[PDB]
User: Fold Dihydrolipoyl dehydrogenase from Burkholderia cenocepacia.
Amino acid sequence: KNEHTTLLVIGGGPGGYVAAIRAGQLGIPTVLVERDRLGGTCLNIGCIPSKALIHVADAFEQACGHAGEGALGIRVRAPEIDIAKSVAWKDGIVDRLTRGVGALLKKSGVRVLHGEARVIDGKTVEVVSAGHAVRIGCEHLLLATGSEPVELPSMPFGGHVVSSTDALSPATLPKRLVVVGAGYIGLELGIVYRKLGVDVSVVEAAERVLPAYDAELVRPVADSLARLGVRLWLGHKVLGLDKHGAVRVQAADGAEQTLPADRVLVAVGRRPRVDGFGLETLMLDRNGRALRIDDTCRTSMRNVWAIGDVAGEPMLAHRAMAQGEMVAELIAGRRRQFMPAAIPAVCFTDPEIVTAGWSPDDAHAAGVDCLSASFPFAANGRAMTLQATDGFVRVVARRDNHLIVGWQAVGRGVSELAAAFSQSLEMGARLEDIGGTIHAHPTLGEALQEAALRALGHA
Amino acid sequence: KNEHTTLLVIGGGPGGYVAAIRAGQLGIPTVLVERDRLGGTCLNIGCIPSKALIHVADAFEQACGHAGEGALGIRVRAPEIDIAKSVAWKDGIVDRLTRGVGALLKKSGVRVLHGEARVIDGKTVEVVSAGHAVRIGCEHLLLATGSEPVELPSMPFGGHVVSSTDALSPATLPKRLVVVGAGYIGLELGIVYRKLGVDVSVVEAAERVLPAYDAELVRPVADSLARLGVRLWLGHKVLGLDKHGAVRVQAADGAEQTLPADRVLVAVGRRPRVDGFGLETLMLDRNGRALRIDDTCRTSMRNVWAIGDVAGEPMLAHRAMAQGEMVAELIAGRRRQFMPAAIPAVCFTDPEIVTAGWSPDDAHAAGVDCLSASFPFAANGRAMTLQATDGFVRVVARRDNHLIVGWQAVGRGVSELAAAFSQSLEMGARLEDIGGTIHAHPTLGEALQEAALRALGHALHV
Ligand SMILES: Cc1cc2nc3c(=O)[nH]c(=O)nc-3n(C[C@H](O)[C@H](O)[C@H](O)COP(=O)(O)OP(=O)(O)OC[C@H]3O[C@@H](n4cnc5c(N)ncnc54)[C@H](O)[C@@H]3O)c2cc1C
Ligand SMILES: Cc1cc2nc3c(=O)[nH]c(=O)nc-3n(C[C@H](O)[C@H](O)[C@H](O)COP(=O)(O)OP(=O)(O)OC[C@H]3O[C@@H](n4cnc5c(N)ncnc54)[C@H](O)[C@@H]3O)c2cc1C
Ligand SMILES: Cc1cc2nc3c(=O)[nH]c(=O)nc-3n(C[C@H](O)[C@H](O)[C@H](O)COP(=O)(O)OP(=O)(O)OC[C@H]3O[C@@H](n4cnc5c(N)ncnc54)[C@H](O)[C@@H]3O)c2cc1C
Ligand SMILES: NC(=O)c1ccc[n+]([C@@H]2O[C@H](COP(=O)([O-])OP(=O)(O)OC[C@H]3O[C@@H](n4cnc5c(N)ncnc54)[C@H](O)[C@@H]3O)[C@@H](O)[C@H]2O)c1
Ligand SMILES: Cc1cc2nc3c(=O)[nH]c(=O)nc-3n(C[C@H](O)[C@H](O)[C@H](O)COP(=O)(O)O)c2cc1C
Ligand SMILES: Nc1ncnc2c1ncn2[C@@H]1O[C@H](COP(=O)(O)OP(=O)(O)O)[C@@H](O)[C@H]1O
Ligand SMILES: [Cl-]
Assistant:
């Protein structure tokens, strides 16, 4: 059974399915191959499940009266959680979203193939299923195979040691949990478990949590971990398990300690999926363990494109989707299609961190003289009505023309400011534009206007 | 005891204090006068208290398992609430914020006098306190006296009949509450009480609730009112109270029932404060009950300005703040750089309603040919993870050039999208701009992008 198409997309994740949909809507014959389930990591074992379990944990924290309910005059009595049912609810959401994706692919004229794909050459792929074996030819090959968790060499995945995947579908809650990695995945999940009554410890090699973000921005997250009772082991590397199932931890000076645990989450990073499916035959230029690409997602081989996590950092769903749309547009012969100067991100810890564009340090590294100003939520009315006064909002702008080049915010319930950050950046707003924009009262968003004005005050 | 300044501000509400602060920062000698408490209505008996109580109610609803906690595998035991302590908590927030306004006024070089201010003439004022009085001359007079609740003459305030003020400082929760008027104030407070276990009935003269918003936008609020248990008496006028303390209501055809009540909230509107402080002398033109002003907040008298609620609709704090800031800047000599921007608004009912710019009806009334599209939260991944799938985001844009002229949204926890809506309108975004802007996943915000593409799809259709 020999087949042919114009665009062959390997991987049914955000990058892949969004790319295929747009392609189909543009009239490009397209075939999408997916070994597991449509939606990839993002829907099945990443974004949605984590955000779903974060909602359960926040809801359980509040029910327990651990989110300051007493101060409001609400005297509570201990609730109970059936984690299996929490996970089943989360799975229901994932079910509804996958079908929606599947139906959207159908409506766009894309033919989905359920199978494991092996690349034979730049314009030929073998798709293997339960007994099937078809060979598909193509004009364009779009690689969007994503990524997988990085396994610690001294402590592999199995038994008590798990990845984010199993952490998102627990059958039971453990008494003690040790998390390796104070990145956004390890902390988001670490906090989920802590709010659910689990004794949680985090092990990070860097001098502080969330090393990818600057110091000022992370401080309110550190404080929160302190109040929540999460034990932090900063400047410590994991050497492996001992006989009693405890995690051996080594400090900078050399002296070691062991943290007991009946469950260990390793969240040290993510590795691009480039091995095991004949990608060797193409011999594509590499950028670390990821496929090298130019700013239009083209690889070193003509008509072989790469998007999403398989094309490196930043490993975000919206970035993969935006990249996929750009590729579909190019194949359809459309010009003027560029990736934006700034990609927003939200880290769903408590408090949350939201960023778009440059931080003050990123602005100095790029050789641009910039001023910045922040406004604390401690002086924002809305924040006080929500009992969420920690954190702040920061604006970053060029000193010469006041063009905004970055936004950062840390606080509870600040995630939805992300849209204001990326849209203002996409429009090229200046401090004066924001300073002059009337913001609804009372809102957390008012802090954006105040930050801009404060930057114009000590300008 | 005669004293002098350049700018004399009557009222320490959002308009007055923001104006005095700005003016002070710009080096203008300023005197602000407040008869009661700094922060005005917004901080002491309006914006903040209502949002605070809405937080308490939401916390209680959630503690009781009335917001779908069972579906998340969480089994709860019923909580109890000490409402006096809820009010004390709220008054604490209010008090902290008022002292913040006080400290900022001092740090800005403003001289704050506590007392009743009376107009002698356009350039002179009298500030009276307990055994103290001063005549103060000014070059510019800023009137920012605010608003007051409208009292039904056929059911005056007293005893069981309360205004928003007492409803925001209850000593006890009533068994049955009747709310008159289904405006944003009446519904916000109606919902607070209902979530706290009170039987609530709302009486409204208009055909539906929140009559100032379009039907499609308020439909999810009416559905939520039904889910919550709030009884709605639509197309009904409140006549008065019978001997039993019940509310006598009259339908359109003439028929009439009585709603048993042990507490009645009258939220039929708000009125500008223009009487009892010497304004009559100044023959200032009037816009209905309010003071008439041009787009720069100038009254018909020279160097007499008016801002905020005393200057009519829309009665919102951020508008008052904007106007107060504009006035200070004009007196300082700085010309205006941005034209009066769109005035957003957030209705904190459950679900919430957020709006900025024009709705499809407003656009047609202004004579601008527009199209619009919506995207439901029922299809949004973030919304599903938050158990907030009712509602939608709608974008409104000009058919000729795709410039967005308005945004509306209805859903649980959509208030913070206000920044995005307000900032995009001020920048002049087109459907294309939003459509091609990356939005973080997973967020409610992604619906804005999806809505813009929906609309753009129609605009570019054969
Ligand atoms: C716990 C966790 C939380 C996260 N939270 C967020 C968040 O809040 N926001 C955010 O933006 N990002 C988040 N991410 C990252 C996000 O999931 C990824 O950036 C996104 O999934 C990348 O999409 P993709 O299409 O590039 O790859 P993937 O989503 O991994 O899709 C790749 C797909 O291709 C298939 N595939 C691979 N090789 C083959 C082959 N040879 N043949 C056939 N099929 C193949 C796989 O089965 C897979 O389904 C999170 C990740 C994790 C692990
Ligand atoms: C229940 C409720 C909820 C609300 N919620 C919101 C909301 O969520 N968002 C929003 O934007 N708006 C809201 N508002 C509206 C908001 O409170 C008003 O729009 C805002 O307070 C108007 O500000 P202002 O400065 O015009 O007048 P005010 O805030 O009323 O301040 C006027 C001040 O002037 C003083 N004063 C009057 N006469 C004299 C005199 N002769 N001498 C000295 N002092 C004097 C008064 O004591 C008062 O302090 C709400 C209102 C109510 C009633
Ligand atoms: C039936 C009726 C008669 C009126 N008569 C007079 C008058 O004689 N003199 C005068 O100066 N002004 C009168 N008004 C105007 C009133 O005092 C307010 O100024 C006006 O309702 C403000 O409405 P709004 O658009 O600002 O809505 P909001 O202030 O946002 O909300 C107030 C809501 O209360 C409702 N409402 C008002 N009165 C009643 C009532 N009796 N029963 C149930 N609901 C009610 C309104 O329909 C409105 O939806 C009347 C209004 C109504 C509806
Ligand atoms: N006693 C009741 O339970 C009752 C009776 C009628 C209507 N309603 C309510 O009013 C709404 C409209 O129903 P409809 O089309 O049959 O009536 P309608 O629109 O024809 O008018 C309402 C009439 O029913 C009477 N009434 C009695 N209880 C009422 C209540 N709780 N709310 C409003 N009106 C009430 C009024 O006197 C009025 O004449 C419904 O949503 C319903 O919940 C309730
Ligand atoms: C300032 C003002 C506001 C009023 N607001 C209302 C109102 O909201 N609803 C209403 O039914 N009647 C309102 N009325 C009038 C009442 O219908 C009143 O019962 C009727 O006009 C009789 O007035 P009288 O007692 O002066 O004769 C208002 C009157 C005034 C002066
Ligand atoms: N390939 C790898 N092998 C072993 N350890 C790794 C690897 N990649 C990263 N780490 C470890 O992970 C820790 C950093 O984790 P984290 O800050 O969570 O990163 P990320 O945010 O990328 O997940 C460090 O201790 C680092 O040494
Ligand atoms: Cl696009």
About this structure: The pocket of flavin mononucleotide (ligand 5) is lined by residues B 150, 152-154, 268 (CB under 6 Å).
